[PDB]
Amino acid sequence: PALTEAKHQQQFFQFRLSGQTIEVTSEYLFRHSDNELLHWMVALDGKPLASGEVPLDVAPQGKQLIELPELPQPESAGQLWLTVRVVQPNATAWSEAGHISAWQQWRLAENLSVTLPAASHAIPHLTTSEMDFCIELGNKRWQFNRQSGFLSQMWIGDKKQLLTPLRDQFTRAPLDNDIGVSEATRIDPNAWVERWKAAGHYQAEAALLQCTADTLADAVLITTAHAWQHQGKTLFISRKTYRIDGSGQMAITVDVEVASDTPHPARIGLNCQLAQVAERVNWLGLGPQENYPDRLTAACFDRWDLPLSDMYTPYVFPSENGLRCGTRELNYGPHQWRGDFQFNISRYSQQQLMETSHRHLLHAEEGTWLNIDGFHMGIGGDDSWSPSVSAEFQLSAGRYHYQLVWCQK
Amino acid sequence: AALLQCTADTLADAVLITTAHAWQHQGKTLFISRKTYRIDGSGQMAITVDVEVASDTPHPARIGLNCQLAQVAERVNWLGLGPQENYPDRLTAACFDRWDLPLSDMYTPYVFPSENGLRCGTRELNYGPHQWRGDFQFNISRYSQQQLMETSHRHLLHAEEGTWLNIDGFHMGIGGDDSWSPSVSAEFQLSAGRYHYQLVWCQK
């Protein structure tokens, strides 16, 4: 997937947007843009409102101004984005006709949603047991284990939806860059992985600090607090709220605190193993290829739909992979999640990835493993034998907040 | 500001209030602010703020709250960066400790008045019987932002009725590479789109 990043950064045409005008600059030193078409397009959250085509006429090292027709100004809420692509109409000796040689995208506007969800005709119904809290609403049921403080299971009808409870995750199956040259015999203590390991990130223990349930007039509200510790040190604290309303939507709010003296964590998110297994993955966010925080310029914000298989990157030596960033809506099966996050989805758990040395040895697990990250560390790469993730991409803030909505159709 | 929602509920350990407001201007929704206030049996009020900023509006100078307190005290005590005025792009010289100054010192008498006096990375602020905790930046004085902005010379400012307090979850940098063009670097503009902050307010 890195190849795309290269392709984009190395493109020969550069763009600037000013008002309704696009300014094109050519980085060719000798040729004129004589086999180039510019396609543009405006979309609102993935929905297309307008498209166009213009042929390029730029001299090597020159500029071309492209005047855009008046753009649509939807009322509907969402993000309006402009995307341009350069196409080579005719084939060449090294390319086919219709080859895309450059692209660029811009956010034009945003209409914030000031809307209120309508009344529910009922509200969920709570039930306290000793072991759990159980909320029910129609066919839908959710259960929270009182000893772990986690959402342990959920049903739609009589069908269980999870094989594993939903929980916080702060680590990743290490990348080659996270490892560098640390060998088991000859450990390299500066390698990220060595530091995470040693701080106990990989083996910290969750401790329930608090798990309460309350009935409000419009919904049921659950509150939890957990601490992850390791040998006396509290590495992280996670405080959440789950609110289930009469519409069957569950809203989750997460606030995490990270000890300033622990190595910055690879990620801040949640995970679970879903029971279900589907064909496609559909999302509204950056894509379509795998993208990470320090490797996402080539990606575009749109609506993508791929087969599950494509959400996995078969690096010969396995590690965390497949992420997609800046996602606002994710759909898989009957589920739907909304917020602002990054995720990955596949049949391999982080643990399996991390424990299998060759791709050919991985085996698909029981359902689908989903990792939803509020934040994720960069990947680096300036070199592979020293820490190469720039500071702007390390999770060093100390306090993080994220939220999501989970629902079914 | 437009009220979108204001609910109250009784939980077992406290009372919970929830609000949502939208700020608009000529049809456009510039910002949305959603909060929760939770008052427990200990008399502490915890506030949680989540703001959304339209990506196409110019980044705002700040994201916070304000109010005019009735009280007027002598000293200001805080645990955060100080002791002098510090802003996000001007705070390396400041130190994180416990400071105590006279109210007067929390004001910077620039001949031509403007926003001033801020202190960043504050974890606890005490003034009078009040106490606030969180992670924020603030300023405190007898002049409202409106007065500062409307008075051209320092000598013309008049102390207002009580104390004006500005608690910011976030604040834009000040710049200065030059004074005749936009000089605030990008890393100091409030461009994230979504902001979250929280505090605890209590009395002694």
- d(C-alpha A219, C-alpha A213), whole Å: 11
CA A275-A278-A280 angle, 5° bins: 145
- d(C-alpha A341, C-alpha A285), whole Å: 9
Amino acid of residue A76? S
Instruction: Give the bridge partners for B197, in sequence order.
Output: B49
Q: What are phi and psi of B149, to 5 degrees?
A: -75, -20
Whether the CB of A79 is below 8 Å from some CB of chain B: the reply is yes
Residues comprising chain B, all counted = 204
Instruction: Give the bridge partners for A240, in sequence order.
Output: A224, A254
CA distance B22 to chain A (A): 7
Whether the CB of A108 is below 8 Å from some CB of chain B: the reply is yes
Q: State which H helix or E strand residue A377 sits in.
A: none
Task: Say if residues A316 and A240 touch (Cβ distance below 8 Å).
Answer: no
Which residue reads 């929830």 in tokens?
A: B18
Which residue reads 């005047």 in tokens?
A: A67
Query: Which residue of chain A has the CA closest to B18?
Result: A216
Nearest to A209 by CA among A231, A232, A238, A235: A238
Chain A hits for B136, Cβ within 8 Å: none
Q: Assign 3-class secondary structure to chain B.
A: CEEEEEEEEECCCEEEEEEEEEEEECCEEEEEEEEEEEEECCCCEEEEEEEEECCCCCCCCEEEEEEEECCCCCEEEEEEEECCCCECCECCCCEEEEEEEEHHHHCCCCCCCCCCCCEEEEEEEEECCEEEEEEEEEEEECCCHHHHHHCCCHHHCCCCCCEEEEEEEEECCCCCCCCCCCCCCHHHCCCCCEEEEEEEEEEC
- d(C-alpha B119, C-alpha B69), whole Å: 19
Whether the CB of A214 is below 8 Å from some CB of chain B: the reply is yes
Which residue reads 């905790």 in tokens?
A: B133
Nearest to A85 by CA among A116, A56, A49: A56
Q: What are phi and psi of B86, to 5 degrees?
A: -140, 145
Q: Do B7 and A116 touch (CB under 8 A)?
A: no
Q: For the CA atoms of chain B, what is the radius of gyration?
A: 18
Which residues lie closer than 8 Å to A274 by C-beta, 6 or more apart?
Answer: A161, A162, A163, A332, A333, A335, A367, A368, A369, A370
Query: How far from each other are the two terminal CA atoms of chain B, in whole angstroms?
Result: 32
Q: Which two tokens stand for residue A155?
A: 């049903």
- d(C-alpha A179, C-alpha A189), whole Å: 10
Task: Say if residues B190 and B63 touch (Cβ distance below 8 Å).
Answer: yes
Q: Do A116 and B54 touch (CB under 8 A)?
A: no
Whether the CB of B196 is below 8 Å from some CB of chain A: the reply is yes
DSSP secondary structure letter of residue A202: G
Which residues lie closer than 8 Å to A202 by C-beta, 6 or more apart?
Answer: A171, A196
Query: Which residue of chain B has the CA closest to A397?
Result: B135
Nearest to B157 by CA among B104, B112, B116: B112
Chain A hits for B12, Cβ within 8 Å: 212, 214
Q: Which of residues 148-187 of B touch A (CB under 8 A)?
A: none
Amino acid of residue B12? A
Q: Which among B7, B32, B56 has CB closest to A114? A: B32
Task: Say if residues B168 and B132 touch (Cβ distance below 8 Å).
Answer: no
Topology classification of domain A117-409: Beta-galactosidase; Chain A, domain 5 (2.70.98)
A84, exposed or middle or buried, with CB in 10 Å at 0-12, 13-18, 19+? buried
Which residues lie closer than 8 Å to A77 by C-beta, 6 or more apart?
Answer: A111, A112, A113, A114, A115
Nearest to A342 by CA among A317, A314, A379: A379
Q: Locate all alpha helices (DSSP H) within A250-394, ordered by sequence.
A: 350-355
CA distance B25 to chain A (A): 13
- d(C-alpha A283, C-alpha A343), whole Å: 10
Instruction: Give the bridge partners for A78, in sequence order.
Output: A111
Query: Which residue of chain A has the CA closest to B54?
Result: A110
DSSP A88-155: E-S--SSS-TTEEEEEEEEEEEEE-----PPP-SS--EEEE-SSEEEEEETTEEEEEETTT-SEEEEE
CB–CB contacts below 8 A, A to B: 42
Q: What are phi and psi of A155, to 5 degrees?
A: -125, 150
> For chain A, give me the number of helices (H) and strands (E)?
4, 24
Pairing of strands A335-346, A399-408: antiparallel
Task: Say if residues A343 and A323 touch (Cβ distance below 8 Å).
Answer: yes
Give the residue numbers of the binding site of B for substrate: 180
Task: Say if residues B131 and B203 touch (Cβ distance below 8 Å).
Answer: yes
A120: left (phi over 0), alpha (psi -120 to 50) or beta: beta
Task: Say if residues A377 and A267 touch (Cβ distance below 8 Å).
Answer: yes
Q: Which among A108, A114, A401 has CB closest to B29? A: A114
DSSP secondary structure letter of residue A180: T
Give the residue numbers of the binding site of B: 180
DSSP secondary structure letter of residue A332: E
Q: Do B54 and A111 touch (CB under 8 A)?
A: yes
- d(C-alpha A277, C-alpha A392), whole Å: 36
Half-sphere exposure at residue B116, Cβ-oriented, CA atoms within 13 angstroms: 19
Query: How far from each other are the two terminal CA atoms of chain A, in whole angstroms?
Result: 32
According to the entry, how was the structure determined?
A: X-ray
- d(C-alpha B168, C-alpha B121), whole Å: 10
Whether the CB of A391 is below 8 Å from some CB of chain B: the reply is no
Helix-strand-coil percent breakdown of chain A, rounded to 5? 10, 50, 40
Chain A hits for B22, Cβ within 8 Å: 112, 114
Superfamily of domain A11-116: Immunoglobulins (2.60.40.10)
Which residue reads 């969180």 in tokens?
A: B134
Task: Say if residues A408 and A156 touch (Cβ distance below 8 Å).
Answer: yes
Whether the CB of A121 is below 8 Å from some CB of chain B: the reply is no
Instruction: Give the bridge partners for A109, in sequence order.
Output: A80
Chain A hits for B198, Cβ within 8 Å: 255
Q: How far is CA A245 from CA A126, A175, A239, B11, in A?
A: 11, 40, 20, 16
Q: Which two tokens stand for residue B129?
A: 């019987």
- d(C-alpha A343, C-alpha A322), whole Å: 8
* Cα diameter, chain A: 77
Q: Do A114 and B4 touch (CB under 8 A)?
A: yes
Cis peptide, bond prior to residue A288, ω within 30 of zero: yes
Query: Which residue of chain A has the CA closest to B21?
Result: A114
- d(C-alpha A148, C-alpha A400), whole Å: 22
Task: Say if residues A340 and A250 touch (Cβ distance below 8 Å).
Answer: no
Q: Do B56 and A109 touch (CB under 8 A)?
A: yes
Q: Which of residues 15-34 of B touch A (CB under 8 A)?
A: 16, 22, 28-29, 31-32
CA distance A365 to chain B (A): 36
Which residues lie closer than 8 Å to A171 by C-beta, 6 or more apart?
Answer: A196, A201, A202, A265, A266, A267, A350
Nearest to A379 by CA among A291, A308, A248: A291
Pairing of strands A368-376, A219-230: unpaired
Q: State which H helix or E strand residue A281 sits in.
A: strand A280-287
Q: Which among B22, B194, B198 has CB closest to A114? A: B22
- d(C-alpha A260, C-alpha A262), whole Å: 6
DSSP secondary structure letter of residue A316: S
Q: State which H helix or E strand residue A274 sits in.
A: strand A267-274
- d(C-alpha A74, C-alpha A110), whole Å: 10
Q: State which H helix or E strand residue A342 sits in.
A: strand A335-346
CA A260-A341-B6 angle, 5° bins: 90
- d(C-alpha A248, C-alpha A162), whole Å: 17
DSSP secondary structure letter of residue A308: G
Q: Which among A116, A216, A399 has CB closest to B5? A: A116
Query: Which residue of chain B has the CA closest to A216?
Result: B9
Whether the CB of A45 is below 8 Å from some CB of chain B: the reply is no
Nearest to B73 by CA among B141, B124, B143: B141
Topology classification of domain B1-204: Beta-galactosidase; Chain A, domain 5 (2.70.98)
Q: Which among A79, A214, A403 has CB closest to B12? A: A214
Which residues lie closer than 8 Å to A215 by C-beta, 6 or more apart?
Answer: A126, A221
- d(C-alpha A63, C-alpha A16), whole Å: 10
Q: Which among B5, B9, B196 has CB closest to A217? A: B9
User: Contacts for B102-107 with beta carbons within 8 Å, 24 or more apart?
Assistant: B102/B74, B102/B75, B102/B76, B103/B72, B103/B73, B103/B74, B103/B75, B103/B76, B103/B140, B103/B141, B103/B163, B105/B76, B106/B76, B106/B139, B106/B140, B106/B141, B107/B141, B107/B142, B107/B143
Q: Do B13 and A111 touch (CB under 8 A)?
A: no
Whether the CB of A409 is below 8 Å from some CB of chain B: the reply is no
Q: Locate all alpha helices (DSSP H) within A242-397, ordered by sequence.
A: 350-355
Q: Which two tokens stand for residue A332?
A: 């898989």
Cis peptide, bond prior to residue A263, ω within 30 of zero: no
Q: Do B7 and A217 touch (CB under 8 A)?
A: yes
